[PDB]
Design a binder for this molecule. Structure first.
Ligand SMILES: CCCCCCCCCCCCCCCCCC(=O)OC[C@H](COP(=O)(O)OCCN)OC(=O)CCCCCCCCCCCCCCCCC
Ligand SMILES: NC(=O)C1=CN([C@@H]2O[C@H](COP(=O)(O)OP(=O)(O)OC[C@H]3O[C@@H](n4cnc5c(N)ncnc54)[C@H](OP(=O)(O)O)[C@@H]3O)[C@@H](O)[C@H]2O)C=CC1
Ligand code: SF4
Ligand code: SF4
Ligand code: SF4
Ligand code: SF4
Ligand code: SF4
Ligand SMILES: [K+]
Ligand SMILES: [Zn+2]
Lengths: 48, 360, 340, 208, 114, 43, 41, 156, 291, 176, 95
């Protein structure tokens, strides 16, 4: 890369990180979607 | 310690390949054939591709055929190296294993250069091959083929004349010709028992009828003659590799029928027909006409066959895999009659058995 | 009620049981069985561990992916407990130790830590809190074990009015310290007892039945505020109990009496070891203490758990203590113990 | 049709048709159909009662000499009343040829074992019994060969699901590898990939 | 409706085969609990054998009961030698599996399955 | 077009036959050496 | 002869190995699949 | 004071002696075994790091699960793992031993070896390269280095 | 078709039009098959789609900012051979090869349209018509096609009972069921009654009828009013469409009294329109002059 | 077309018989094997000093998965679901919906790395070169759930390794 | 342009975040939530609109075969810009 540097864009990381497994900065998976079924919130009024 | 009965219980590696094959398309079932014989992968790819091409009534271009035969010979070199060296390691001589595994690493480097994966390339496909060879690959193949004769020479010098090696192989596992035919033995067992049979000479495939080579023939059917036949097959594989390097044709590497092989990325992003075919080939897959066929090739372990039944849809109705290890392990009970523990491990070694292709 | 806590599936490994449990001291003896029974119905299990993760390795394969969450905690750090129980809905307290060490005495592991856990579970809004006491917990008991257990049980009850307190008698199992103690005492001689061990009565309970009772007490809405007493189906004197243990192990059984003051000095000698002591005076006093009867408290039969007797599991516990000669002896070729 | 169309072998087609006529007129008791495919492959579909004489004739006749049993399979077609189809593949080294022999059976009709001709048929039809439930009578050692030791059922039957009815996991209460009813974390997503347009008019079945 | 038999022409010979197989299994249960070092009593194993035999008591077709006799003899030969493990023998005892709902109310409480 | 190709004259020669050196002396030389050592040691 | 008069109902439920909960609580549906209305094929 | 210093030094000593003397057992099942013995080839040569095969489970330290774990293999794997003396470590190789891989939906394949044995390091790939397996072995060594067993004993 | 392209010039581009919040329109993909115009002119009967222009520049559209709003505006999505007219709520959600198709019955109206619910991993994705020549030949009303997103909203998921304040709070099945049973055991005769909704199956109706009959209560009511004078609900002749849904194909004189079949039973109105177009049906209405 | 391996009859001459007797008594071929091993002792060993040296690789290498972007910030994937339909192991799960500006993008894109067979069909079925199989192979984890990548992890991998994947695609794309 | 919920947990570009009463937040305790902060919508919104002088335009994403399939965009509307369906670039006729 001293002779032929790679093309640089605005989103490439400016700080490389090694394998973070076993550290507090490790990756934890999760669902990336919102709720699927909306639920009928009951009213907050007396029924009489 | 004299063996009275052997019952090899198998199925510990039974993954049930030939049901998941029925549940997937042809391109999705293509990587399943790499993992049957994980040391003769590209020959399995060639067998599956030949069966599907026979069912589809299409043929690969000549350059794809020459690449297929050259890389099949490379895979035969890899398999014979592992077979001889693991047999020697079972007997007790472990130096040739470390001696020739450097060459095995070099052929793995060739596999990764041509395909991007060290073992399971998924490179040979119905219709030809997936990608053309990178520039400068054949010169490195030429250097490796130049030195591999000396490598085989030093392995043979350390093995073929040693009296300790001879005593473990001269009269171990003797199979007659008639029982070799009757038990379904194929390949090196037949050729070491004196049967002049080879599928590359008798029922030829892609361009094996244009290259010339010799076939080693044993005389006593023992482990020694089979080991010598494997060494001579390695040398003849080097001969075929040089012949294929000298006679490589120019041109394309996929079949030009765009309804079977996917078009290039240059035209997929330009032409409407190419994009439509790319979509319907990577989502549904090509429709193979109905019919049942049985295509068998000469893998390094022997006759490797695929029995394919297609119902006209985009997915196979039935796929059966015949591997020579099944018949060889069936005959292991007869081959070990009147022997010992070291003799039975020698008989196990002289049968090149990978249990992925046996247990399926 | 939340949408992600509604139960789903058929109660298998990958199902959702709607139970978010924080089990304290899960790397011990009851914790293995409790985490195993919780993970097989598909429950979110939180394990706070003080020891090495290598000791939590055996707990790792007990449940599905992402269902067991391991994290560090300290007994004298309420903030770690607040971190552990802030998302749970059931808290189970199994913290205990058979001896007092240089850092923790009996008061710390039996009074301070349960009170802190119950207080921070009440402050975090946990509906269900379960504390595991001892059956013979007495304020006037001889040994510090039962005194501290009674004081801690009272503190937990006074600080968590909806806490369920479970009082087992004595647990026998594969990795126990009750039948294994008797089967390992044979190394040192001829199994000394106090007054030949025919003045004390024991009713041990199987570990799996205790785990089933704990799970049913988690599920049962009417167990909130109860104080159960988990005891076995049969009562044995100590002498013929040890006799049955040695008859199962097919070991020579030559008991001899020992005075009470002489046994305490023996327990003093064993408990100076910097490692885990083989025995101590507290273990001596608890071994020779009669298990009290509390008919006014509900037992395992009120939670739908059928008590399994010692005769069907003693061989499973004590088969590893036999020699090669008696390794393959069957179930029935041992005369069963005599009850009262 | 030169570069991308596979050339055909008419000489092999004619020779295999001649041999099919030869075989079907030598043994009229068992042979039901003889068919040569477009890639020159012979199929002799016979009655299941004539498994042993047809194979004996193909192994021992001077003009057949099909000395090798290359591969022996079984195919399940549930819409037939004889849902199992047993397929024998034979290789003749003297005349350098391959022939296929197909027969049919259902779940309860036994098939005569062919270990008296080829000895690889022992393990082959042992595997067929394991994977399909086809019982082979007069068999020396008929057991399971690929499935689990306590396995119930035959996996390659088309009514058997892709994932089995049980799965194995290690339980610490009994300290044992126990089998439980299956619960996939992610279900096998079934894909419907059949096009609703006809591809090959040559294979068009006539209407009702 | 005339079909090929398997071993027995009629139901009496199939019942004879069933009786002989059950005699051999009843002989085998003590050796099974001895060699494999199970923690169950011999009576429990014999009740398990009786229950597994009673699970197929409603079938009257000779060919299918011949096939079940063949499978039972296969499992007996599998257990005579040590080809099963301890886990394969105790897989007949579903101890790890939780008890399922039986009445209508518990099935209605636990889920939508019938 | 640009592709991987063999050269115009093809690649060079590649060996594929056995080449064992068959070294050592004759048997008579070895026996003479052994007898000479034996007699020298005896004297 | 070697043929047996068999008159009972054909069943292979005890040979398939499927458990009873998937054999008496299930319900098979036999149907000709409807045409996908997005297409004319 | 001094006791914490002494137990920290003893922990460092035993961690170095355990992490520099890993003896894996000869155990492979499938493609990934061929890749493991390609890691043992002279190109990479794990014998440099003190890693040498020992066939018996009694004399091994780390078990490398390389291949597909079928239903017929799971009791044998569990038994062999149980006969390995403490301390013992498990390294998972390939997608078959990780989560079933290609054969996840197979009727006779255990979906991941973590259902049977406690796994320390998961090495992904199909097959993972010899450099990848060497990276996993070095990761296991670094994990062993971070053990505080005598520190935990002194603090408890 | 063939396998590759000989075209080398620039492709055309058509300006996209807006026809409503139900149909997404991308007219670069239209091939001018003129199924839009035929469907809107013969079956929908709106006459709002046309072909403006000439030659290669011919565009199918409305020529102005007009919204094609009829009760059968999803069938143009159904009968478009290309992706020019797609479904706006369904846009970019799933793919056809993965949706599981389950045949079901529409309950939005009283026509009884046979439909296919295509789902994806236990989640309803879209509703398509089914071929049934006797009811809904291959069409459905757009309420049937687009009620699913409200079917997945505002759902009742847990049993709720009144607390000590008077608010509905979540509870278990056992507590609520016991409270309902305890109230039911204290009433007998005409102290308990039931009302049926509009989307109720016959199974629930017969179960509630039997349960209320075990307590001797025959007062079971439906929301819709039907006159019970005379025979009433005894004979099936006086409350049924006694001919057929498809019986209007053969009739030649019809008479509608006090109904708007365009918004009550839209497929019945479509069949009436088809009989009017082909067999020259004579139609007369008694009621308000609706369209 | 064939050769007779191991059909060499011996020679009965007395000089060669004495030579064979000398070989038998004095172990000629055993010293030959010793000499071959001794000559193999004095070679350069082929051990590369890992981790300070790496084995050779090709620009077509198939390693860790990543999601690329256009050279303006916009992500390249358009939720066409070709990768999840061509995946032989069913390791890809995609859920999609139109985002706030009406662009066809994903909301869920999961690759199960423990199911993936690393065959590279997704990187060749992508019509926009969005999903790629980068050159990273040293990414072993200590937990099973760390090998279950969601869209954020794949986008982070793409931003981490874009400087290399762009050059590898630039070097290789004329063969595809 | 990441946004943080009141519970302290960040929100991804998909809008996913965990509620306060959700028990699934315990997977982030002692660890961190992996969220990509380079939101593509903001970065594509900052691209300048290209002014061209034809009724129709062609887009390929830049780079030819390294981009998306070449699409054609109509610019007959004087109210809105013509956005490419793949890369999201918007073009506009200068009349
Ligand atoms: C009261 C006062 C006394 C208190 C008790 C403690 C007494 C001393 C105990 C032994 C020494 C403890 C310290 C051990 C090493 C600590 C530092 C360390 O871990 O260094 C790491 C370094 C290797 O680094 P690494 O991560 O492996 O790098 C990979 C290669 N690039 O490692 C190295 O570079 C080499 C490390 C060598 C370790 C020391 C030498 C071996 C042990 C000798 C003494 C014990 C054995 C005596 C003989 C027993 C019988 C044979
Ligand atoms: N004999 C019996 O089995 C009976 C026991 N009980 C009660 O049941 C409970 C569980 O007993 P059991 O599992 O058999 O015993 P164990 O000693 O086997 O387990 C106790 C657990 O508590 C943990 N622990 C101990 N001290 C501390 C501390 N200071 N801080 C944090 N964690 C600590 C231990 O973890 P670590 O390994 O890290 O130290 C371990 O996981 C105890 O409260 C006991 O009194 C009641 C009746 C009978
Ligand atoms: S993970 Fe891949 S390479 Fe390894 S055993 Fe499985 S199929 Fe073979
Ligand atoms: S149905 Fe589709 S293709 Fe036909 S005119 Fe309408 S928009 Fe064009
Ligand atoms: S899927 Fe059909 S309508 Fe859509 S762009 Fe392709 S050819 Fe045109
Ligand atoms: S590399 Fe192959 S197996 Fe892996 S995600 Fe891509 S298509 Fe699926
Ligand atoms: S093939 Fe490419 S564009 Fe299509 S869904 Fe997959 S990653 Fe996205
Ligand atoms: K459409
Ligand atoms: Zn663009």
């Amino acid at each position: 890369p001293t002779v032929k540097p790679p093309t640089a864009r605005k989103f490439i990381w400016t700080n490389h990180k090694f394998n973070l497994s076993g550290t507090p900065q490790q990756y934890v998976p999760y669902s990336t979607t919102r709720k699927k079924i909306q639920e009928w919130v009951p009213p907050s009024t007396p029924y009489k | 310690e004299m063996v009275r009965k052997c019952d090899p219980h198998i199925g510990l590696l039974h993954r049930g390949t030939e049901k998941l094959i029925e549940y997937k398309t042809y391109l999705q079932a293509l990587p399943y054939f790499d993992r049957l014989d994980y040391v003769s992968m590209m020959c399995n790819e060639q067998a599956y591709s030949l069966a599907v091409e026979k069912l589809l009534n299409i043929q690969p271009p000549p350059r794809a055929q020459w690449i297929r035969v050259l890389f099949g010979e490379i895979t035969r070199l890899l398999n014979h190296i592992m077979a001889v060296t693991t047999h020697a390691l079972d007997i007790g001589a472990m130096t040739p294993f470390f001696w020739m595994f450097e060459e095995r690493e070099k052929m793995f480097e060739f596999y990764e250069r041509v395909s991007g994966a060290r073992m399971h390339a998924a490179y040979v496909r119905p219709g030809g091959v997936h990608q053309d060879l990178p520039l400068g690959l054949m010169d490195d193949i030429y250097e490796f083929s130049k030195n591999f004769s000396l490598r085989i020479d030093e392995l043979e010098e350390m093995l073929t004349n040693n009296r300790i090696w001879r005593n473990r192989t001269v009269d171990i596992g003797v199979v007659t010709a008639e029982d070799a035919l009757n038990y379904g033995f194929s390949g090196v067992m037949l050729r070491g028992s004196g049967i002049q049979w080879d599928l590359r000479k008798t029922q030829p495939y892609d361009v094996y009828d244009q290259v010339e080579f010799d076939v080693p023939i044993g005389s006593r059917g023992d482990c020694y003659d089979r080991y010598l036949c494997r060494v001579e097959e390695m040398r003849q594989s080097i001969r075929i590799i040089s012949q294929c390097l000298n006679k490589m044709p120019p041109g394309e590497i996929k079949v030009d029928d765009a309804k079977v092989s996917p078009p290039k990325r240059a035209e997929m992003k330009t032409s409407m027909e190419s994009l439509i075919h790319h979509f319907k080939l990577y989502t549904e897959g090509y429709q193979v006409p109905p019919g049942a066929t049985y295509t068998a090739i000469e893998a390094p372990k022997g006759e490797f066959g695929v029995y394919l039944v297609s119902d006209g849809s985009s997915r196979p109705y039935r796929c059966k895999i015949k591997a020579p290890g099944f018949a060889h392990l069936a005959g292991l009970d007869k081959m070990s009659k009147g022997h010992m523990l070291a003799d039975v491990v020698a008989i196990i070694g002289t049968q090149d058995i990978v249990f992925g292709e046996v247990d399926r | 009620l939340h949408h992600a806590v509604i139960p789903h599936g058929k109660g298998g490994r990958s199902s959702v049981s709607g139970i978010v449990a924080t089990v304290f001291g899960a790397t011990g003896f009851l914790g293995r069985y409790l985490v195993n029974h919780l993970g097989r119905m598909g429950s979110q299990v939180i394990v706070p561990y003080r020891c090495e993760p290598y000791d939590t390795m055996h707990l790792r394969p007990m449940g599905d992916l992402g269902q067991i969450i391991f994290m560090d905690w300290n007994g004298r750090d309420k903030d770690s407990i607040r971190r552990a129980v802030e998302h749970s809905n059931v808290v189970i307290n199994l913290v205990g130790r058979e001896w007092e060490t240089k850092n923790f005495d009996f008061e710390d592991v039996f009074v301070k830590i349960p009170q802190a856990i119950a207080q921070v579970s009440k402050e975090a809004g946990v509906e269900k809190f379960i504390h595991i006491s001892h059956l013979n917990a007495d304020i006037k008991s001889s040994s510090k074990y039962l005194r501290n257990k009674a004081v801690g049980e009272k503190e937990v009850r006074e600080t968590f009015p909806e806490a369920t307190i479970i009082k087992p008698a004595d647990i026998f199992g594969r990795e126990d310290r009750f039948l294994n103690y008797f089967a390992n005492i044979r190394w040192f001689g001829g199994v000394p007892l106090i007054s030949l061990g025919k003045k004390t009565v024991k009713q041990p309970v199987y570990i799996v039945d205790v785990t089933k009772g704990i799970i049913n007490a988690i599920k049962d809405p009417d167990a909130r505020g109860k104080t159960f007493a988990f005891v076995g189906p049969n009562r044995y004197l100590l002498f013929d109990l040890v006799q049955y243990v040695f008859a199962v192990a097919h070991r020579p059984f030559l008991p001899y009496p020992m005075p009470h003051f002489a046994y305490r000095w023996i327990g003093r000698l064993f408990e100076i070891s910097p490692f885990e002591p083989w025995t101590t005076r507290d273990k001596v006093e608890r071994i020779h203490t009669t298990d009290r009867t509390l008919p006014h408290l509900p037992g395992l039969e009120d939670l739908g758990v059928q008590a399994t007797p010692l005769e069907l599991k003693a061989i499973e516990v004590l088969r590893r203590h036999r020699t090669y000669r008696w390794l393959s002896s069957e179930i029935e070729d041992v005369q069963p113990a005599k009850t009262v | 049709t030169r570069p991308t169309v596979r050339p055909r072998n008419d000489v092999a087609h004619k020779q295999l048709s001649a041999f099919g006529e030869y075989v079907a007129e030598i043994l009229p008791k068992y042979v039901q159909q003889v068919q040569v495919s477009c890639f020159s492959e012979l199929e002799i579909c016979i009655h299941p009662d004539g498994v042993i004489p047809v194979l004996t004739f193909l192994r021992d006749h001077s003009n057949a000499q099909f000395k090798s049993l290359a591969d022996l399979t079984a195919v399940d077609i549930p819409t037939r009343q004889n849902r199992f189809e047993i397929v024998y593949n034979l290789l003749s080294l003297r005349f350098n040829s391959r022939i296929r022999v197909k027969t049919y059976t259902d779940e309860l009709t036994p098939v005569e074992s062919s270990v008296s001709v080829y000895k690889a048929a022992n393990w082959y039809e042992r595997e067929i019994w394991d994977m399909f439930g086809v019982f082979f009578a007069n068999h020396p050692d008929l057991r399971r060969i690929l499935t689990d030791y306590g396995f119930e059922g035959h996996p390659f039957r088309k009514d058997f699901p892709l994932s089995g009815y049980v799965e194995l996991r290690y339980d610490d209460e009994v300290k044992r590898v126990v089998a439980e009813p299956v619960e996939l974390a992610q279900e096998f997503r079934k894909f419907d990939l059949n096009s609703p347009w006809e591809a090959f008019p040559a294979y068009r079945q006539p209407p009702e | 409706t005339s079909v090929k038999p398997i071993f027995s022409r009629d139901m009496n010979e199939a019942k004879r085969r069933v009786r002989e197989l059950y005699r051999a299994w009843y002989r085998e249960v003590p050796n099974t609990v001895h060699l494999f070092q199970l923690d169950i009593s011999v009576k429990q194993g014999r009740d398990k054998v009786r229950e597994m035999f009673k699970k197929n008591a409603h079938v009257t077709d000779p060919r299918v009961v011949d096939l079940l006799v063949i499978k039972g003899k296969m499992e007996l030969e599998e257990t005579i030698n040590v080809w099963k493990q301890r886990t394969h023998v105790m897989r007949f005892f579903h101890e790890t599996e939780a008890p399922r709902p039986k009445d209508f109310l518990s099935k209605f409480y636990v889920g939508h399955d019938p | 077009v640009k592709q991987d190709m063999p050269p115009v004259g093809g690649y060079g020669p590649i060996d594929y036959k056995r080449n064992l050196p068959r070294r050592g002396l004759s048997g008579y030389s070895m026996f003479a050496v052994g007898i000479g050592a034996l007699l020298f040691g005896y004297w | 002869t070697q043929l047996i008069t068999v008159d009972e109902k054909l069943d292979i439920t005890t040979l398939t190995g499927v458990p009873e909960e998937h054999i008496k609580t299930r319900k098979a549906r036999i149907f000709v699949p409807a045409r996908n209305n997005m297409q004319s094929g | 004071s001094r006791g914490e210093y002494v137990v920290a030094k003893l922990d460092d000593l035993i961690n170095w002696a355990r992490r520099s003397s890993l003896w894996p057992m000869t155990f492979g099942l499938a493609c990934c075994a061929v890749e493991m013995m390609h890691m043992a080839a002279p190109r990479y040569d794990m014998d440099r790091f003190g890693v040498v095969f020992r066939a018996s489970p009694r004399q091994s330290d780390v078990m490398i699960v390389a291949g597909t774990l079928t239903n017929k293999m799971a009791p044998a794997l569990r038994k062999v793992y149980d006969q390995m003396p403490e301390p013992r470590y498990v390294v998972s190789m390939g997608s078959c031993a990780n989560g079933g891989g290609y054969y996840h939906y197979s009727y006779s394949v255990v979906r991941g070896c973590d259902r049977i044995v406690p796994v320390d390091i998961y090495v992904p790939g199909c097959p993972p390269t010899a450099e990848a397996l060497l990276y996993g072995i070095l990761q296991l060594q670094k994990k062993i280095k971070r053990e505080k067993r005598l520190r935990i004993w002194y603090r408890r | 078709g063939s396998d590759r392209s000989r075209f080398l010039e620039g492709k055309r581009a058509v300006e996209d039009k807006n026809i409503g919040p139900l149909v997404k329109t991308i007219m670069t993909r239209c091939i001018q098959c003129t199924r839009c115009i035929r469907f809107a002119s013969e079956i929908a009967g709106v006459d709002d789609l046309g072909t403006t222009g000439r030659g290669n520049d011919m565009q199918v559209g409305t020529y102005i900012e007009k919204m094609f709003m009829s009760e059968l505006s999803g069938n143009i999505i159904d009968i478009c051979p290309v992706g020019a007219l797609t479904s706006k709520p369904y846009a970019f959600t799933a793919r056809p090869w993965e949706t599981r198709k389950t045949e079901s019955i529409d309950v939005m109206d009283a026509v009884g349209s046979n439909i296919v619910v295509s789902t994806r991993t236990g989640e309803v994705m879209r509703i398509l018509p089914r071929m049934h020549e006797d009811i809904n030949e291959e069409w459905i009303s757009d309420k049937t096609r687009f009620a699913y997103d409200g079917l997945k909203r505002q759902r009742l998921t847990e049993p709720m009972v009144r607390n000590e304040k008077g608010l509905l709070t979540h509870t278990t099945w056992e507590d609520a069921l016991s409270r309902v049973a305890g109230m039911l055991q204290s009433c007998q005769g005409n102290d308990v009654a039931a009302i049926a909704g509009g989307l109720v199956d016959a199974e629930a109706l017969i179960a509630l009828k039997d349960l209320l009959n075990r307590v001797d209560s025959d007062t079971l009511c439906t929301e819709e009013v039907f006159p019970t004078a005379g025979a009433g609900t005894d004979l099936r002749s006086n409350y049924l469409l006694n001919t057929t849904i498809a019986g209007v194909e053969e009739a030649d004189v019809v008479l509608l009294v006090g109904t708007n079949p365009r918004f009550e039973a839209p497929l019945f109105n479509a069949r009436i329109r088809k009989s009017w177009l082909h067999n020259d049906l004579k139609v007369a209405l008694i009621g308000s002059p609706v369209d | 077309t064939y050769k007779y391996v191991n059909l060499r009859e011996p020679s009965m001459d007395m000089k060669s018989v004495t030579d064979r007797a000398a070989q038998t008594l004095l172990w000629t071929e055993l010293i030959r094997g010793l000499g071959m091993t001794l000559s193999y002792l004095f070679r350069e060993p082929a051990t590369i000093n890992y981790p300070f040296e790496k084995g050779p690789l090709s620009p077509r290498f198939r390693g860790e998965h990543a999601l690329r972007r256009y050279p303006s910030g916009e992500e390249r994937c358009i939720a066409c679901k070709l990768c999840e339909a061509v995946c032989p192991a069913q390791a890809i799960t995609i859920e999609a919906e139109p985002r706030a500006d009406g662009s066809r993008r994903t909301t869920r894109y999961d690759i199960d790395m423990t199911k993936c067979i690393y065959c590279g069909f997704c990187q060749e079925a992508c019509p926009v070169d969005a999903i790629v199989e980068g050159p990273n192979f040293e990414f072993s984890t200590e937990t099973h759930e760390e090998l279950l990548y969601n869209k954020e992890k794949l986008l982070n991998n793409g931003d981490k390794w874009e400087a290399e994947i762009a050059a590898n695609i630039q070097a290789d794309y004329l063969y595809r | 342009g990441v946004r943080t919920s009141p519970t302290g947990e960040k929100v991804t570009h998909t809008g996913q975040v965990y509620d306060d009463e959700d028990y699934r937040r315990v997977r982030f305790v002692g660890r961190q939530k992996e969220v990509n902060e380079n939101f593509a919508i903001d970065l594509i919104a900052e691209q300048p609109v290209s002014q061209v002088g034809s009724r129709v335009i062609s887009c390929d994403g830049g780079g030819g075969a390294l981009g998306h399939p070449r699409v054609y965009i109509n610019l007959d509307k004087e109210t809105k810009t013509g956005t490419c369906g793949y890369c999201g670039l918007q073009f506009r006729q200068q009349h």
